[PDB]
Design a protein around this ligand. Structure first.
Ligand SMILES: [Mg+2]
Ligand SMILES: [Mg+2]
Ligand SMILES: [Mg+2]
Ligand SMILES: [Mg+2]
Ligand SMILES: [Mg+2]
Ligand SMILES: [Mg+2]
Ligand SMILES: [Mg+2]
Ligand SMILES: [Mg+2]
Ligand SMILES: [Mg+2]
Ligand SMILES: [Mg+2]
Lengths: 59, 63, 31, 50, 50, 107
RNA sequence: AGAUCUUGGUGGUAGUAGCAAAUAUUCAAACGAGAACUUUGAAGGCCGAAGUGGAGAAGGGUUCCAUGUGAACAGCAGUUGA
RNA sequence: UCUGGGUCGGGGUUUCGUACGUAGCAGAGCAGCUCCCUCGCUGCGAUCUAUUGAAAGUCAGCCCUCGACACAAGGGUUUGU
């Protein structure tokens, strides 16, 4: 019943799941699992991954 | 019973290796009676002993 | 002359292996 | 039991029901179907059974 | 096992009036059926089944 | 009747899970032989060489996940043996294993 | 009765340590009283031409080659064998 | 037993990430065919797009089946105040 977050994949993140990333420039990201997190950490564009929400809305 | 002798003689007559000698698994008794290279020649002509073809190593991929 | 029954057994005695193996050419019996 | 940790009333706000057989990310079947929409298996299900 | 979300009512703590998640264990408990009664008598050697 | 023949599919992947690389294919034929001993009850099981090729088709460790076989319980009236019947398991090539039941098959 | 005595024999240890260097075997058949190991066939693999291939020198001395045996030997077995 | 437990099949869950084939006036271009066409068509061509969150696996120590198949009142050894 807390704040509902969205990932690199755009999926819904329920409380007690995933991890949160706080970069040095001051931006805060949240990930649903290590698959979505490691894709983000490898500078991979979410609009080119077929199971990502951002891809499905673009196509 | 044991065709060790006949496979060796067939290899020499056919001028191949024992890799390429095929003895008929059904006519084991017929081949077992061939204790000389002359009978081995007869079995080769009759078709009980057959020289298997060379394993294919194509160069189509290389070309 | 080759009939259906002789052809059916011929499939057995001409295949001496699996795919890629040579077909048997003859099996002659002489004495 | 006299400590404050005991005798403390518990009021649940949410119970997680995601799949524990992997990284579950949906709470119910209905939520999963609503999020993803129809699939190929359902598309042919309505085709074969009308 | 699963986890919950609940509101904490522990005054003086940082998590007071805050939401926390906590691991929980589900223990299925169907009703028991009573099939007998045992009596015990206190002896100078312990309890023994009367 | 005891001259029955049935067509089964065997989850090889289920019965090979955990076996080491150099032993997966040999264990697959031990599990196939043990399988046919169960539904047919005959300790004398003969495996067709075409089925042996099918198991070893992709090497010794990459055994196919599923195999479609045909158990054929036949009379052992060829020599005096402690077993009166033997099961000859053959190989059935299929394109898919979806919706494949165990079907009785005629002669 | 002794001499870490001489020679020979026998125990416990003990059916124990162990039979773990170099990727790997499987299916059917034959012979046979008997087959994990022999043979044949079919698969899957290795040596990968500086070979686990084909031939010699030194050394060995009949190990070469056929047929047969199944006592002993080939540290399991064997219908196989230097 | 008011059956049972298996084996397949199905459904769910989940993992990865969008299969083969076909189609495209997608595609760096290139090589051929022009009575021809009035801007055209025939091949080779990584990759792209649609089919297609598709394909594939998923208990072997995942969950629910009641769909199909066969099997289960069988075996052996002992035990007396
Ligand atoms: Mg888990
Ligand atoms: Mg003395
Ligand atoms: Mg003295
Ligand atoms: Mg030991
Ligand atoms: Mg050992
Ligand atoms: Mg190699
Ligand atoms: Mg050499
Ligand atoms: Mg010799
Ligand atoms: Mg020995
Ligand atoms: Mg299933």
């Amino acid at each position: 019943m807390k704040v509902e977050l969205c990932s690199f994949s755009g999926y819904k993140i329920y409380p007690g799941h995933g991890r949160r990333y706080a970069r040095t420039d001051g931006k805060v990201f949240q990930f649903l699992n290590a698959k979505c997190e490691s894709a983000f950490l490898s500078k991979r564009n979410p609009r080119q991954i077929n199971w990502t929400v951002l891809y499905r809305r673009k196509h | 019973s044991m065709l060790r002798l006949q496979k060796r003689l067939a290899s020499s007559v056919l001028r191949c290796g024992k890799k390429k000698v095929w003895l008929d698994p059904n006519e084991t008794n017929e081949i077992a009676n061939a204790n000389s290279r002359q009978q081995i020649r007869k079995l080769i002509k009759d078709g009980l002993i057959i020289r298997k073809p060379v394993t294919v190593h194509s160069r189509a991929r290389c070309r | 002359i080759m009939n259906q029954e002789k052809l059916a057994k011929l499939q057995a005695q001409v295949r001496i292996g699996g795919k890629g193996t040579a077909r048997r050419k003859k099996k002659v019996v002489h004495r | 039991q006299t400590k404050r940790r005991a005798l403390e009333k518990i009021d649940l706000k949410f119970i997680d029901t995601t799949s524990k057989f992997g990284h579950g990310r949906f709470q119910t079947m209905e939520e999963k179907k609503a999020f993803m929409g129809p699939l190929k298996k359902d598309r042919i299900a309505k085709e074969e059974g009308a | 096992m699963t986890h919950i979300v609940r509101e904490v009512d522990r005054p003086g703590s940082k998590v007071n009036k805050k939401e926390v998640v906590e691991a929980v264990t589900i223990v299925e408990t169907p009703p028991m059926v009573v099939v007998g009664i045992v009596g015990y008598v206190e002896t100078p050697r312990g309890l023994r089944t009367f | 009747n005891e001259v029955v023949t049935r067509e089964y599919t065997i989850n090889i992947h289920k019965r090979i899970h955990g076996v080491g690389f150099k032993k997966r294919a040999p264990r697959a034929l031990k599990e196939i032989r043990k399988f046919a001993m169960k539904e047919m009850g005959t300790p004398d099981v003969r495996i067709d060489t075409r089925l042996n090729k099918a198991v070893w088709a992709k090497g010794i460790r990459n055994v196919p996940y599923r195999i479609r076989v045909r158990l054929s319980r036949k009379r052992n009236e060829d020599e005096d043996s402690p077993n009166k019947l033997y099961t000859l398991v053959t190989y059935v090539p299929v394109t898919t294993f979806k919706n494949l039941q165990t079907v009785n098959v005629d002669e």
